[PDB]
Design a protein around this ligand. Sequence first.
Ligand SMILES: Nc1ncnc2c1ncn2[C@@H]1O[C@H](COP(=O)(O)OP(=O)(O)O)[C@@H](O)[C@H]1O
Ligand SMILES: Nc1ncnc2c1ncn2[C@@H]1O[C@H](COP(=O)(O)OP(=O)(O)O)[C@@H](O)[C@H]1O
Lengths: 498, 498
Amino acid sequence: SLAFYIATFDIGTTEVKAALADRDGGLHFQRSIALETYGDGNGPVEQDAGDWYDAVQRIASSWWQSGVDARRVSAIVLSGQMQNFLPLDQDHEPLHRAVLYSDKRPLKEAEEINARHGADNLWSALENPMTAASILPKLVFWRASFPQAFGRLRHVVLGAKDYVVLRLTGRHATDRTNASTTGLYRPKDDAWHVELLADYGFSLDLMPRLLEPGEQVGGVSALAARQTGFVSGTPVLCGLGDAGAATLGVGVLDDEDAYLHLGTTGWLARLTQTDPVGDMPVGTIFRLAGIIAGKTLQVAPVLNAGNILQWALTLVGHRPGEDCAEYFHMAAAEVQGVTVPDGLLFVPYLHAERCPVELPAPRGALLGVTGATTRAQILLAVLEGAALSLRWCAELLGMEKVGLLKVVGGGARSEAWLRMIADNLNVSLLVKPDAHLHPLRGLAALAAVELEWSHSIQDFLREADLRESNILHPQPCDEGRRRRKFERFKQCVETLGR
Amino acid sequence: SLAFYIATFDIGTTEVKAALADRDGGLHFQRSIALETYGDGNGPVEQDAGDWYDAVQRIASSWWQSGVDARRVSAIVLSGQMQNFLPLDQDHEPLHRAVLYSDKRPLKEAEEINARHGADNLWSALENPMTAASILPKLVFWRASFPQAFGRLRHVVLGAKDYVVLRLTGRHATDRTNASTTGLYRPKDDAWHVELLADYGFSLDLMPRLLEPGEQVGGVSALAARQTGFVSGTPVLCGLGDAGAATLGVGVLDDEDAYLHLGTTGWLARLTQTDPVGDMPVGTIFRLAGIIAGKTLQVAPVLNAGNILQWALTLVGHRPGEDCAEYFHMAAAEVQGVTVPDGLLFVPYLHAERCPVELPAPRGALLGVTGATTRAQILLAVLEGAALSLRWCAELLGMEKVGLLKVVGGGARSEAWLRMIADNLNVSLLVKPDAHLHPLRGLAALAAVELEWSHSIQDFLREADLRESNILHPQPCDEGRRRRKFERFKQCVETLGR
Ligand SMILES: Nc1ncnc2c1ncn2[C@@H]1O[C@H](COP(=O)(O)OP(=O)(O)O)[C@@H](O)[C@H]1O
Ligand SMILES: Nc1ncnc2c1ncn2[C@@H]1O[C@H](COP(=O)(O)OP(=O)(O)O)[C@@H](O)[C@H]1O
């Protein structure tokens, strides 16, 4: 016999990762192409969409030239950045650089939209945040500044991998998981928010068609075949937003499954059965549809995360231009066998925050310092404080029934932090290494089901897994005492607001 | 000719310092005897009074055996600990260990006294604090626990050097500066608080006679001559409390002269013309009489001072048993050329405080931390925060007309701190080295006037001074901006109180 593969891609924020997936869950011919970002962190966060496809071309070229036969690639499926704004003309050419999710320039427009429609009405219909990062504001903001370009507007792409899917098949579509993030989509009606788009003079024709991740969008076109070297007619599946693929990739499949992304920034996620939406949160809470039939990923986005620890390296003598390796090492060494006093408390919002609280301005403090306070206790309180933010998020997400938390990211390198998190959230943790491959595993599994390589996604992931860890469980604690420090921690955030 | 000398002593908290003073302001045959303190910092702070005299004997012996002729000693004068409680019997023997000023065990008794008499009445009459450290509470507390000993009570010594003066002459006296500290003395009537002592069943006979520092208490008695080797009849002057002698010693003589003691703990002092006492302060403010005719030293006692800096060495890696030298060095190096952000604020009450605020419990915090905050900025903010406490104290003392601040103590070793203090208090500083000799210079000068060696104290100090510095002046500042950070600093202390 001969090997067949699924071409998997992630169009991520800083790079494009790819691999050819065999039926046994093996990921081969792994590739990585770096993408540039524009804006220098002064407000704008943009990319040239062509770079994404350019990246896909380069990877496919490198595959054929590495002896891979494009006919043995039985399907193409991608994940990528969610919540983009990308305006295209009639020939599918960008009218503007892609504006990324982290761009939040349109403050006044989001304010207006919320005022005009009612925040409770919008929340009630979208089940998600309407903020400066949402697509409607970015679209309004753009129409006003570029009226000519706007005249030529024909399509609005809302996820990075959707553009590449467009380049490949010539059809404009997206997944419900990504749609959720946009603040343009109604989960309950399963449709774009018609009256809201019409009220601002935007046609439905601008919207992509909604598709299941496993549905075929179309086949690779003759032209795309010439551009990439894929075989014309090779199935291109819809795929899904990277949050969806990453969580699928690590086995987040069942009710009360949960996930934690601990990078420079982070997010905590709880999968559950789709329920009637509750009252507006006083903390940005996403509810992503479409990852599993009948289930919703409840996500709390965290802006102060692994960056809190990174900051604290200053405490052990780190300076602006130095490699951080030796300092993470000292910090870990120093907090060994240390205990944090009930009175010592670190509030970790060194940057503006969304969850668990809206803080447009930082609120960073070290409280309860006495003469007996050591630097080691400080370092630890930082981890504790960061973990208390996380417990706050879990409380918002309703995670009291979650048994196990899948953890990814560089943040998990702090053994001391993990311990803080398990203990304070009172949940077990399992670390999942190689976070860059996760969305690819998820995609490969959904593709495998569609190709009839496997009966289910679950079955697929569990096999690759025999291919290759000990769960970390919480120490026993004075529930009630950890709980009192937790409430005080809440009172401190409020009190620091004056 | 041949040298004549004044025997000067300071009966301090941790040691007895002494020297023979010539007429040119020279201090010779310097001695130091260490004293032990009992209580292990668990509440009690006591010493054996006999140790004080024992120390004086040993020093005088060492003088005669070093070729000094006791007849050339023309007067004996001492300073020492103020605000002691020392109960003696009819033979002048202690009925209890001397209870030092820092002892504050009698919480309930001070509370009772204040309730019974009115805090405003007491303040109005005593012009000083009535607290657990005051002599009346300690006396009540002692009578209740030792009724037998109390039956034998005949004299109550209120300053350490007064006991030694008692051992030397056989007369019981004290100075008005020390009397002030006791909460038993009425400045305006110039007398002990009769109704207050009588109301608690204590006779006036227990009180020492009030004397000027320069007045002769008596001559060395035959017996004391045998015990010490001094010449019988050698004048023993009354002398004064160490705060009085230390400030005299450095030239604090004129209205709006000021003084700063920056040790582990500290105090700030402003000399001014005796005025009608104002309303009770919400911050422990002493008003000491008797140092200069018609003038009053206004003192703010600080409990968080050089100990704040000492604590901060933890930040640069200091650990419990290590020598501190190299760490003070790094901290100084690290804050060089650094600026403290207007938003970064350190509240330095790592221990309970009296001035500028009553804080029975610590209130230590680092506020306004952002991601850009460095350790160096932290170190500096600590100094700034400590200095802001000091500015608060100056504001309480009414120091807006003070031109120059005489500074003593190990605290002054931080060049960076001095700069913070000058800038924030907006006053010039002059550091006075060898703080242990200060009370001796002061005593020697007052003695010199009495012996007709010099026409005035001022004249005396200014000469020794030709024997041997650049004043440090404040940088120009946005008054108004330093002032806004100062007010915020006040608001933060209150807000941290919940
Ligand atoms: N050696 C380490 N030990 C502890 N944490 C680490 C270490 N190195 C990196 N980190 C953490 O990794 C975080 C970023 O991880 P990462 O997964 O690359 O997220 P991101 O792609 O968002 O920057 C940092 O903020 C830091 O706290
Ligand atoms: N090398 C130094 N540099 C800066 N400050 C110093 C240094 N060494 C000692 N100190 C300060 O000295 C203070 C104590 O000084 P000191 O005059 O002996 O007062 P005390 O007798 O009350 O303990 C400490 O709290 C510390 O901050």
